[PDB]
Amino acid sequence: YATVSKTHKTVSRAYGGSRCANCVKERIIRAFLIEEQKIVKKVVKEQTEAAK
């Protein structure tokens, strides 16, 4: 592989050279859900602090 062009070795995608694009979607969805929950957790923290 030290002489083959990167075009054959790498596909035009994020994580293309090490992932099949199926788990990439899963991890993207997981990250988005984690961010949404963190926003929800911060909202819950603000609600709790509104009383104390």
Q: CA triplet 39, 16, 33: central angle to 5 degrees?
A: 15
Place of tokens 């788990």: 23
Q: Token pair of 37, please?
A: 């929950």
> Which window, 5-13, 27-35, 36-44, contacts RNA (CB under 7 A)?
5-13
Residue from 22, 47, 49, 51 touching RNA (CB under 7 A): that is: 22
Interacting residue with RNA among 18, 49, 51, 52 (CB under 7 A): 18
User: What residues line the site for RNA (CB under 7 A)?
Assistant: 1-7, 9-10, 14-18, 20-22
